[PDB]
Structures are given as C-alpha cells and as structure tokens.
Design a protein around this ligand. Sequence first.
Ligand code: 6S7
Ligand code: 6S7
Ligand code: 6S7
Ligand code: 6S7
Lengths: 211, 204, 202, 207, 212
Amino acid sequence: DDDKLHSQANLMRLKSDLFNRSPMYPGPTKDDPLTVTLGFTLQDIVKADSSTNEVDLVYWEQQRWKLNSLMWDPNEYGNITDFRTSAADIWTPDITAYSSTRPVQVLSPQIAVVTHDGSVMFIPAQRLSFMCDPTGVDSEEGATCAVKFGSWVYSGFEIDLKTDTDQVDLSSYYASSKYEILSATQTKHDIKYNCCEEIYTDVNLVVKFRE
Amino acid sequence: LHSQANLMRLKSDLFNYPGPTKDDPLTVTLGFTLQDIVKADSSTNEVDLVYWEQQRWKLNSLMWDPNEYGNITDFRTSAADIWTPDITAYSSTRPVQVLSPQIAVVTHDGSVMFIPAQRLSFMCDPTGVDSEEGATCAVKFGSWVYSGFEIDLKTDTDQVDLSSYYASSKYEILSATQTKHDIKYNCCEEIYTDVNLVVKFRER
Amino acid sequence: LHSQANLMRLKSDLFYPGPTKDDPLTVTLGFTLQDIVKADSSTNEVDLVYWEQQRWKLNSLMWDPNEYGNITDFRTSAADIWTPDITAYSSTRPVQVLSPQIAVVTHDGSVMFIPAQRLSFMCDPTGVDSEEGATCAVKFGSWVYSGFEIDLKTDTDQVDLSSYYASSKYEILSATQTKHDIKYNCCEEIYTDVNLVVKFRE
Amino acid sequence: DDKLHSQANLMRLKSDLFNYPGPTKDDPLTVTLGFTLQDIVKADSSTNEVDLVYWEQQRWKLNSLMWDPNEYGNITDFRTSAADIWTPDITAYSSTRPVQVLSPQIAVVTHDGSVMFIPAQRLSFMCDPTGVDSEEGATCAVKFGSWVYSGFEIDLKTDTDQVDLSSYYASSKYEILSATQTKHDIKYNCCEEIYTDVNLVVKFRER
Amino acid sequence: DYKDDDDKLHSQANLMRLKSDLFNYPGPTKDDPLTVTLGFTLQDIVKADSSTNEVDLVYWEQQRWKLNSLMWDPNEYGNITDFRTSAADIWTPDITAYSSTRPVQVLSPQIAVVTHDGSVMFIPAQRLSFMCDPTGVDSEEGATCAVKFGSWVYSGFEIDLKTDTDQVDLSSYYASSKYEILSATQTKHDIKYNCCEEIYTDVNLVVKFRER
Ligand SMILES: CN(C)CCOc1cncc(N2C[C@@H]3CNC[C@@H](C3)C2)c1
Ligand SMILES: CN(C)CCOc1cncc(N2C[C@@H]3CNC[C@@H](C3)C2)c1
Ligand SMILES: CN(C)CCOc1cncc(N2C[C@@H]3CNC[C@@H](C3)C2)c1
Ligand SMILES: CN(C)CCOc1cncc(N2C[C@@H]3CNC[C@@H](C3)C2)c1
C-alpha cells in the first residue's frame, strides 16, 4: 500500500530524472555514431497480387540501440531495471522500407522498453505492401522477393546498422497462411545513391515462398 | 451548479500514475462481447469481427471519498487523460478500427471501466465454414510490452457474451470462449499472459 | 468593428463538465435520411447517408444579447464545447463525417449540432427485391452516459424523408425513430437509445 | 542584403496583422465561389455515386486584412496556413464519402484584404449515371454552401454561371457536354433561416 | 577513452547548440524569390487502370533550396556539416501534383537534411494516383502519360522552379514491375490560369511505358 506508492514514486523520479534533468539524446552524428540492430519476425504473407506485383507482409521489426543518456543504477531507484515509454517521447531510428508501395500500417502499440544499461528495444508489428513479382508461387520452387530496410536520412557514418542475427525469425509464422515460407535471410549492405556522396546502409530481407 | 464545481474540483485533485511495475503490478480484467462476424475471406485467410472489449482495472490514485466531492460516485474522462492498458490482438492483419468514443468511466473506489467497440481483421483460415462443424479460428489478446509480472490478465468467465450477436449475420456462432493462459518462455524468466479468443462458426 | 469586439467578448466570457446524476441533461435527436447508398448481401452491411440533429440547452451558455451588441447566435468548433457521445450501436466501420464539425449556440443556451454522416451497419437486405422490401434497424445513443445523465428524446417518431435522394437505388417505404431504455449485462444503470427502423426496397 | 530586409517586412506584416471571429448578421460576408472541373473519374451505376476531381475557388475580403504595401516594402501578397485564419465552411450537400483534399491547405492574402483559397478536391456524390452511354448523356447535380451560416451571415455569388472547363482532362473516360453553377436561396425544415448554395449541374457522357 | 567519451558528449552539445542558435525564414516573396531544384527518381509503375484512366506511381521527389539563414561555420560547431530536422519545423515548398486523383501518400520519414552552406535537401518517397489513359500499354511503343508538379499558391515570381537534368532517374526502377519504362523526362513549364493574373511554373513528368 505505502510500499506500492513508494514504487510509483521511484519510477516517476527515474523518468523525471532522465527526461527533464538532462538533455535528451538529439540523434547520432558523424562524431557520435549509433549502432542500430535490426531483426525481422515474419508472421504472415497475407496476399500476393500478380496484377500489380505487390505482396502484403505482416511482420515484427525488432529494433535495438543503446544510449549512455538512458543509463541508470537500479540501486538509486528501488531496484527498477526496466520501464516503458511512448516511442514518440524518445529518439527512434527512421527505419524505412525502400520499396514499399503503400504507407506502412501499424498493428501494435508504439511503446519502447528501456533497460538500466541504456539499451532500448522497440518492436512494432506492421503490415507492409512492397514490390514483389509472385511468378512461380504455384510451383515447387516458389517465388523469391526482397525488400530492404534502412535509415532514410542518416548515412552509414551516423547510424551503424547491423542485424541481430543471420536468420529471419520464422517461429511465429502463421501455420495456416495461404503461403508457406521456404526461406528468409536478412543481410546488411552498403550502397551509394545518385543524389548524394555519402554511403548508406540497409538490411536486405530476402524471402522464398510458395502457395 | 454546486454539482458541476464539485466534479471539476475532483478532476483537478486527481489530475494535478506511471504504469504498473513488478513491485506494483496491475490486474486488468478482460471480457468480449461478440456482435458480428462480418466477413470471412478464403483468398487471404482473414476474418473480420465486430466486438466490444470490456476492460476493467482499479488504481489507488483514482480513489476519492464522495463525501468530500458532493457525493459524486463516477465521472467520464477521455481515455487520453488516464493511463490505459496496451491490450493488443497478436495476429491482426489490419489496424483495428474503433467504433465507439474513447471515453472511460472512473468510479470512486478507483476502478476504471473502458469498453471500446472495435472491428478486427485477423489471421483465420475459414475452410469448413460451409459444413456442419464449421470453421474454428483463434486470436490472442494481451499487453504488447508488459509481462505477466506487471500486468496480470484475468476474465470473469470463459464464455464470450453472445447475447448481442447479430441474428441475421452471414455466420452463426457455434461456440466462443475466452481463456486466460499463463505461459513461460525459456528465453525469459517472467510469466506471460494472454486471453485466447476461440470462435467456432459456420454459414447460416 | 464593435460587433467583432462584442462577439470576441461574448466568447471569452463564456470560455461545463458534462451531465451528471445531479445535473442531468436532455438531448433531442432526429434523423434526416438522405440516401441508402449500397446494400451488400455478401456481408449484410448497408450504407446510409443521413443528418443527425442533436439539441441541448445549458445555463452556462446563456447570455443577454443587449449586453453583447444584440448578438443572438454564434458558431464554435465542436471540439471547443461538450458534445454528446451519440454512437451507432451496430456499425461495422467507423462512421464517416460529411459536414464541418461546428455547432451553433443560441443566447438561451441551446446548442444545435447537425453532423452529416455515412454509416455502415449490420443489416440483412433479403427481400429488398420484392414489394414488401427489407427491414433493418440501427439504434443510436450515448455510449458512456446512462439515461440518468443523458435524457434522450425525439420531437417525432417519423424520420425526415423530405430530402431523400429521388434517384437512389432504393426507395424508402417507411422510416421510424423511437426512444427505448436498455439494460446491459456489464452495468446496473439503464441506458437510452433512439432506434431507427427503415423499410426499403429497390 | 536587401533580401533580408524583405524577409523582415514580411515577418513584420504577418506579426502586425495577426495581433476576426467570422461573419455575423451585423457584419456579413459575400464569398465568391467558382468551380474548375478537372475530371470525372468514375460513374458507379450499382450505387449511383459519381467521382469528380475539381478545384473550388473561394474568395472573400476582410478589412482587418488590409495593409499599405508602402509601409511593408511593397509586399502585396502573403501566404498563410488555412488553419490559422477563418475560412468559410463550404460543403457539398449530397456527398457520399468525406471529400478528399489534394492540394496544400494554404490561403493567399492580398493587400486589399482579399483572401483566395482554392482547394483541389475529389468528391463522391449522389448521381444516377443512366444514359451516359447515349448521345444525350447523363445529367447530375450537387450543390455547395455553408453548413452552419445562413444567407445573412455568408452569402455567395458566382462571377459566371459557366463552370471553368479549361483544365478538364482531355482523355477522361467522360466528356463534359455542359456544366453550370447557379446560386439559389433555400430553407430547411430544422431551421427558420435562409441558406444559400451554388448548384453545380453537369451533363456528361462516355468518351 | 575518457577523452573519447566526452568527445561524444561535446558532439551532442555542439549539435544542440547549433540547432538552438538556428531556431532561436518566413518564405519567399517577389523581392526575395527562392529557386527550388526539382528532380524525380521513378521506382515503380504499380498499376494502370483503364476503367478509370488512373495510373499509380512510386517515385522519389528531390527538392533542393539554399538559405542564408541556414548557413553556419562548422569550426564554430565542432565541425558539424549537416543536421536533420522535421520538415514541419522549417519552411518547405508546397510542391503539388496537378492531376492527382487521390491524396498523395508519403512513404518516407518527413525529415529534411540541412547542410552548413544553407542548402536544404528533402526527398519524400511518394505513391501517386494521377490522370492517365493507358491506351497503348499493350503495344511496342507503349502508352504516354504526363503529370506536372509545382507550387500550389506561389507564383513563378516567388518560387523559381528548376531542374538540373531533363532525364528522370531510372537507375532504381523496379526490374520486375508489371510495366517497363521506355522513357521519362522532366521539363519546366510556365502557365497562366483563369483565376489569376500571376504566372505559375511547374515541372512536367512525361513517362512512356508498356507491359513487360
Ligand atoms: C547530401 N546530403 C548530406 C543531404 C542528404 O539528404 C537526404 C534527405 N532525404 C533523403 C535522402 N536520401 C534519399 C534516398 C533514400 N535514402 C537514402 C539516400 C537516397 C539519401 C538524403
Ligand atoms: C458501471 N459504470 C457506472 C461504468 C460504466 O462504464 C462504461 C464505460 N464504457 C462503456 C460502457 N457501456 C458499454 C456498452 C455500450 N454502451 C452502453 C453500455 C454497454 C455501457 C460502460
Ligand atoms: C437555429 N440556429 C441558429 C441553429 C442552426 O444551426 C445549425 C447547426 N448545424 C447545422 C445546421 N443545418 C444543417 C443542414 C444543412 N445546412 C443548412 C441547414 C440544414 C442548417 C444548422
Ligand atoms: C490572385 N492571387 C494573388 C491569389 C492566388 O491565390 C491562390 C490560392 N490558392 C490556389 C491558387 N491557385 C490554384 C490553382 C493551382 N495553382 C495554380 C493556380 C490555379 C493558382 C491561387
């Protein structure tokens, strides 16, 4: 009862200390670059449209980064080791699919988890329409498509993009989807664009699937 | 007149809680009323439900003595002015659509009641819907970022309220249940909790 | 010049927490049915375009026009005053607003708010291709206020059909609007709704 | 250098001017309304909806927005987000979907106090397209007026009764045989007051 | 490494200082016009609908301009040469498509990059339905359609519109699209409208395309 509110007080003090008694992280820079880790969990291939060459994917995008300005010692705060916060209240990376054909639709609350070492985990579930030719989807070899994800405005010198893991997480894939996944990989690459001198980094998701 | 000033004073006293923690966990009670299965799509394996999701919780920081506030026992408030649980369907295929105003009722004991009516599109293979046994589909609900140690889910009953179900729907309900379940991953040490909505239905 | 200053003065002087059991509010509801746009026998949704007239009066919005350059009415954004949370109880999509979200406040404290809306709602259209046509119902009322806080009334039980689109695919045989009180399982308090009953055919 | 002084004159103007609550019976307003019909996208005979893209030209004048260009570096016009000023609540009276806005919600103010706001919009409205595959084509109408202001607070006029057809898409699926816009005054059953609208009448057929 | 740590601390401090300095330009005028450079990269023709004569495109729209009020010396700010800002925090040109049939849908974060010389780069990826007759698309010479982009409320005497090439960039065009691009050009034009006396300027995007 009284312990309960002391617990609420500790968490309010921690959020107020982090968000008001110190400047908020303004984003990475060439001199203070930020490593962002990216992982994908494929939940469902909803639809493959061979008349427009678009395919609709439900998936979770795991994003992790780590910030000194979000560190704290649990001993000073009632041994709290995590807290949740609205993703809008903090800096988040601008990860963007580079071949979507519709705005991404958000299916989960936009809430980040901050742990006392300053690491942030943000995992939005989304529905994504992207460019994909499903020719071959009704064959044993299936069809193969790809879509890559990376910052839109930060170079590879500002956001250092990495995959958490080599393997796409298929463990939550909808068993009764119209489409089975034959394989999926996620791979970092560097690339230059015509507009710009600076090098950019993306993670390429390649998926082989079939009916 | 005096009534109105008491209600305003009460809101100011309350409004001028940071979420549940492991040391101060919150019990949120969930209940579903199923109003309609609008549509079942066998080309994409998506089914569309209209339901009311009853949510209830209780916070010491929302309690007040009615005697000190004109004997006021409830008030209405925008869901955006108070903390609310992040209950999410775990297998929707479209953003859930809200069909009712985003207003909660707070009662003097600190209990909150919030009942959004929603249209949900979710992952469901409707094969067998045109047979006697129908099709069977399932969708889990629970917090997106809180574990069973911060947000404790429960139901008052395993029976989905079917008393309001649209009598001329394309699809009739054969059974609909809502079961709390506690799960442990070996990845992680904490308990996790969801309410599994299982619907058996077939064409009328 | 002097009137603009009066109007600005009036609004600043006026600028209510919503109704309560001690201070209940009567809200008057009426419907003008514009069009039955579409009937979908594959999902049993039907789409209506209608006007929803809402009316209520508040002492805290009363003024004497002679104290304010003889102003008798003004316009305000519906977001700047309390409005009733009238909800369609059997929609299948979020209702789509078709008109500006503005109310008119009159010096006696009455407020008039008339949103034009497009609604999809649960409705089986079998029979629509016959002489007797199909019948469907949709009820409207506060979502969170009991009949002890919002007292729902109509001026008439007949839906205004005088604006009904003469070249709609569907003709209105009849349309009624009726107040009723409802108990729900969740809640001890009684709720009040207006039930819209419409018989229509191709 | 002089360009920095010009930016300061603009900021001074916007600041001064922004230090009007809408029209009333004692201070009414006449809004000029015209339509630039761009395209009939779609006629649906299974619901009797038709989809237009058009430009809706709105023009009004307020003394409180007048200024002398001599005082402000000869600036004659500035731009402002349409949310930061009063704009009329012109509404189609028989749309079946929310109007979709296609152009930026920015208005233009001129030193004589005139305001021009011209949203490009896509509208679905109640229209029976029967006859559109014949030589006579189909005729449909949809009227535009204030929702909440009577003729004595907002009046309308048109500069012409002919709709501007000079931007009409020449490869549309539908060709326009005529398009008029005509002011009327009307009463409704809810309300004592007289409302004003401009009725847009369009005769069209398949190309 | 203690040095390495507060090197990072001072970098963040320099970035916030620079942003505070710059934020603590009201648009162009006839006396102080602004030149905007406009260029398109075409990513995909998604869909051509011959029943409504609408076609859907995914492209990048590159907008560039330069302001003296956005200049700074890096030496005074820890050698910072760029920063990111929400496009809502700065003035941006109201470049609009003139024949869209649906609200244009943005696909990229609404963020601009500002560089120490005062130039701003803003590149929204967009999906667009515009008026287009796809007759011919099932033929060797394909179909030809055009959509023009430019300010909606600023005349050519306020926003001076310019390309820095006539060729639409096709190096990112989706190679497995339903449609192949035969050619794509971007060309500035001036024009007068019935409403208004002032002259307006835009960039016309002409695309010739056919079924793959
Ligand atoms: C030159 N400079 C330092 C300003 C960089 O400003 C930009 C602002 N917005 C988008 C981009 N890009 C657009 C494509 C998609 N994102 C990766 C590439 C190519 C960069 C660049
Ligand atoms: C019990 N109490 C004093 C607080 C009531 O809290 C509520 C909050 N939100 C919605 C409802 N309702 C949902 C259904 C639709 N509306 C009419 C009924 C049934 C009430 C009730
Ligand atoms: C009496 N009085 C001063 C209150 C008028 O307040 C109103 C508020 N909202 C809408 C309307 N109307 C809606 C329909 C469409 N517009 C013209 C008619 C019919 C009026 C009137
Ligand atoms: C005359 N004057 C100084 C006020 C001009 O104010 C305007 C405000 N909003 C839009 C426009 N236009 C709309 C069409 C699209 N853009 C090019 C033309 C035609 C201008 C003009």
